[PDB]
C-alpha cells in the first residue's frame, strides 16, 4: 500500500532502571518502529567522567519488549543485544553516541544519541489489539546523569481492504492476512556455559519459527562484552546423522562478518550467523522435532552466552502450504517480500 | 459404586534411608492411598532439640513411589513435593506434626504424625498387576530419632462389570475401562537455574498427559526451602508466535494462592498455577507436539527448582476422542468426573 | 561382496595432548577399522612406576573422531569411552597391555598395546569424501613415557556396482546405497548428577537414530572410574504413562553383563544396557518425539556420567519404508546384516 512514516508526540523520560511502556498508534498496519535515547549525558563533577565502554551506549536500554495483546510477544532483547544486531546490520553506521570510553568535559556534558529498530515486516497492527513497546531501561553511567527522551518514529504501509485479498485474503481464523509474516526476534541467554577448547553443547535452536540469522555474543564478569574468549563457534544438526553447518574458528566468524556487514567486530566477544548462507535459504524448524540444531562454544574461561535470533513466525503457516499450486505461487510471493523485509 | 475404606494391618517402621516396598491389595478399584507417618521423635540428649524447619516433617519420607505391573508408573514425588501439594490441596490442614522448628524436650519426646494422598481417581486395581507402594524415606533429623512407622489407608470403590459397561465397557486392547483417566503425578526436578532479573527458560511440559496444575518451588543451599528467590514466574507457549499465559510476579503468584487455597504460602519459595484457569479446561498436550510450553523462573540466587505436576493420561485416549457423538457424551461424563477426583 | 583386511604403511607416533589425524584409503567399503598404540612404557626413573589404573592403558588416547566430509561423524569417542565398549564386547579379552596398576621396572621398561574397533558396517567409502579418524591422544602416565605408534587395519568390502543394484541401488539423492546403515556411536556426557538412592533423571536418548546398546560409567573425582556409586540404572519411557523397560539395580545390571559378555566387570561404576531385549529387536527413535526416553542414576556420591551410545542411522530410512512390501522384503535383509555387524 502506502508507506508512510512519523514521529509521536509523546516522548519518554529517560529515568534509571525504570519501566516505560509506549503505545504504538495502530493506524494501518506497521512496517518498521525506530526508537532513540536522545538528549545528552551531563558532568557535574569536578574531574570529566569517562562513559562506560561497550555496551554503552546500547545498555542505557537494558531491555526491550515489543507485544500485542500484552501475550504475544513479537520482541524481546535487551539494549545491548537489540543495538549489537542494530551495529551489524547498518554497517555500523548506526547512531550510537557517544562512542565508548568517551570523556564527559568536567562539569560539561556531550550529546547522547543511540537508536534500535524493530523490523515488523507489514504487521496487520489493526487487527490486532495493543501494540506495547515496553522499555525497561538500564542504569544511569557511573558518575554522570542521562538527560535523554525516547523518540518513537513508526512506519505505517497503508494496506487496504482489497490488497489484503490480493494476497490470499484472511487466515484461518482470519485475524491476520493470510501472507501475514510476525518477526519473532527473542533473545535467549544461557548461564555458566564452561571454559572449553572442544565446542561444549550451548543450546538447542527450538522449533516453531524459521530462523535468519542469529547474534550470539558472550559476557566475562571482568571484561564485560570486551573478551576474547568465544574462540569455537559450531551449529551442529544433532538429529539424524550428526552433521555440522558450522565447525568455524571465532576469528573466521568474524571473518564472514567482515565480507558480509562491512564493519569491524563489535568486540572480541561477538558475531552472527546467517542461516541463509549454511542451508539453502531459510532454516526452518516449524515442523522439525526439537533439540535437532544446537550451535556449540569453545569459551577461554568460563562465561555467559546470550542468543539473539532474528526469526520469524508464519501464524497461517499450513494455509500457505496447503494452498492450490496456483494461489501459493503468488502468496509465497507477498511471504516471500515479507521476509527479507525484517532484516535488523 | 460402593466406595469403602479400610487401613491394612500390616505396618512398617520407619528406618533412615530405606526402602519400604507397600503391597497394596487389588481387592476392587482403588479411589485413593493415605499414607501415614505415626509415631514420635524422641530426644535422649541432655538439652532440647529444635526439629529441622520446612520442608520436615515432610522430608523424613525421602521419595514416594506408586506403580502397578512394576513398569507403570502413577507417582513419583518426594515426601517434600507431594508434601507441598498437600499442604495446598487442604487450605494447610494436612497432618504434619510436629511444625517445622518445634522442640524435643531434653529427655522427653513429641508426636509424629504426616500424612500423604495419592488420588488415584478410580483406578481399576483388580486388572493390573502389583500395585506396589514403594516409600524410600529420608534421614532421621539431627539430634532425635524418628520412632514411627507407615499406615495405608486405601479406598476402593466396588465398580461392577456391569457398571463399567455403562462407561463403554474396556479399552482397546481391554485391559482397563475405557473410560480410565490414570493419575501422573510426577515431579521433575531442575538443577542450577541461574539467577537472574528476567524469568530464563526452567523447563518445558513434556507433552503426553493433561496437565491439571503445576507445584513450583525452590531450594536455595543455605535458606533450604526458606528462601524468597522465587520473583518472576511465566508460562510460555514457545511453538508458534510466543505467548504468555503467565507472566505473574511471585507475590502475586502467591497472592492467588491465598484467594484460591486460602492458605498461607507454605514457604517463600512455593506456589501452585490452575492450568485450567489459564486454559480453557485442562492443559493437554497428549497430541502437541514437543517443547511447545515451558516454564520460567527468575531468581534471586541460583539454585533448584522443583516441578511437580498433578497430570493424568487417558490410557484410551483415542477411542474416547474416536466414539460417537452419541457414546462419547456419556464416556467423557465418567471421565470428566475421575479428572476432578484426582485433586491432590 | 569380497571383504579384505590390510594395515596402513604409515604408522602415528603417539605423542601426550595432540591431535594425530588418519586419513583412511577410501579403496572399497570399509567394513571396520582397527587401531593399536603399540610400542613400550618406559621408567627412566630410579624407583620402579606403578602405571595410573583403569581407565589406562585405554585413555592414553584421550578421544577419537571418525568422520567424513569432514561434518558428518561416526564416531564421537573417547579412549575411555569406546575402549570400555571394547572391554565388554569381546569378553574382556580386547587387548590392553599392560594392565591397569602394572609397574614398569626402575630404569627398564614393560610392553604397550591397547586397541580400539570402529564398526562401520558396510559403509559406502569410495562414494563419500575424506574418512578421517582424528585421534586426539591424552595424557603421558606420570614417570613413564609412552613409546608407542598406531596401526591402522581397514577391512574393505569390493562390493561392485552390481552387487548395489542388488540391495536398492542407490538412495534418494543417491549418494550411498539404499540399503546403508551409517553407525553413530556417539558419547553425551553429563555433569554432577546429584547423588540419590531414587534414581534421578541422568538424560534422555534423543531421536533420529536406532540405539543398538548404550554403555554408562560414572567417574567419581576420587575414585577415577574405580568407584560403586552408581547402584540403581533404569530406562524410563516418559511420554504417555510413565512406564519402565530398565529398573535394574547397579550389582544385576553387571550381572547381565556376566551372562550376557562372560566377563567380569570392567569396574564397579560402569555397565551396558542392551535394547534389543528391553523392546522387541532394537530402540529406534528414528520418528519418536524428542525426550522420549531417558535413563536414571541413583548415584551414592555426585559424578560425571558418560554415556556411550553404538546406534546407528538409515540415511533414506524414509525410501526403506516407503519401498514395495515385494523389495523392502530384499532390502530390509541387507540392511539388517548390516545393523548387527555394527556390534562393537
Redesign the interface.
Known amino acids: 500500500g502506502e508507506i508512510y512514516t512519523e514521529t509521536l508526540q509523546q516522548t519518554y523520560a529517560w529515568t534509571a532502571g525504570t519501566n516505560i511502556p509506549i503505545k504504538i498508534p495502530r493506524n494501518n498496519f506497521i512496517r518498521k518502529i525506530r526508537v532513540q535515547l536522545i538528549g545528552s549525558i551531563s558532568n557535574s563533577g569536578t574531574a570529566a567522567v569517562t562513559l562506560p565502554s561497550a555496551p554503552f551506549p546500547y545498555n542505557l536500554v537494558q ?1 526491550f519488549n515489543l507485544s500485542y495483546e500484552g ?3 513479537l520482541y ?1 532483547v535487551s539494549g545491548t543485544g537489540l543495538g549489537i544486531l542494530m551495529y551489524y546490520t547498518t554497517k555500523g553506521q548506526n547512531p550510537a553516541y557517544p562512542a565508548p570510553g568517551t570523556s564527559v568535559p568536567a562539569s560539561g556534558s556531550v550529546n547522547l544519541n543511540v537508536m534500535w529498530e524493530f523490523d515488523l515486516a507489514r504487521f496487520p497492527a489493526t487487527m490486532v489489539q495493543n501494540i506495547i513497546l515496553s522499555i525497561l531501561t538500564g542504569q544511569a553511567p557511573s558518575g554522570v546523569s542521562i538527560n535523554a527522551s525516547f523518540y518513537i518514529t513508526i512506519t505505517y504501509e497503508r494496506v487496504t481492504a482489497q490488497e489484503i485479498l490480493s494476497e490470499g485474503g484472511l487466515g484461518a481464523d482470519g485475524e491476520m492476512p493470510l501472507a501475514t509474516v ?1 518477526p ?1 526476534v ?1 533473545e ?2 544461557t ?2 556455559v564452561p571454559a572449553s577448547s572442544a565446542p561444549i553443547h550451548v543450546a538447542y535452536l ?4 524459521i530462523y535468519k540469522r542469529q547474534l550470539v555474543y558472550v559476557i566475562n564478569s571482568t571484561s564485560g562484552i570486551n573478551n576474547t574468549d568465544p574462540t569455537e563457534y559450531e551449529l551442529k544438526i ?8 558450522i ?1 568455524v574458528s571465532w576469528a573466521a566468524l568474524q571473518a564472514e562478518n567482515q565480507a558480509e556487514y562491512q564493519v569491524a567486530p563489535y568486540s572480541g566477544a561477538s558475531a552472527i550467523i546467517d542461516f541463509r548462507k549454511y542451508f539453502n535459504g531459510d532454516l526452518d524448524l516449524t515442523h522439525a ?4 540444531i544446537e550451535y556449540d562454544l569453545a569459551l577461554q574461561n568460563q562465561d555467559n552466552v546470550y542468543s539473539l535470533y532474528v526469526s520469524y ?1 508464519l ?1 497461517y503457516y499450513d494455509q500457505l502450504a496447503a494452498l492450490p499450486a496456483q494461489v501459493a505461487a503468488i502468496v509465497q510471493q507477498y511471504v516471500a517480500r515479507q521476509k527479507r523485509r525484517i532484516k535488523r
Chains 1, 2, 3 share one sequence.
Open positions: 531491555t501475550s504475544k510477544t524481546s510476525l519473532k527473542i535467549i541467554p548461564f555458566n527450538q522449533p516453531g519459527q544433532v538429529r539424524g546423522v550428526p552433521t555440522d553447518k565447525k522435532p526439537s533439540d535437532s513466525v501464524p
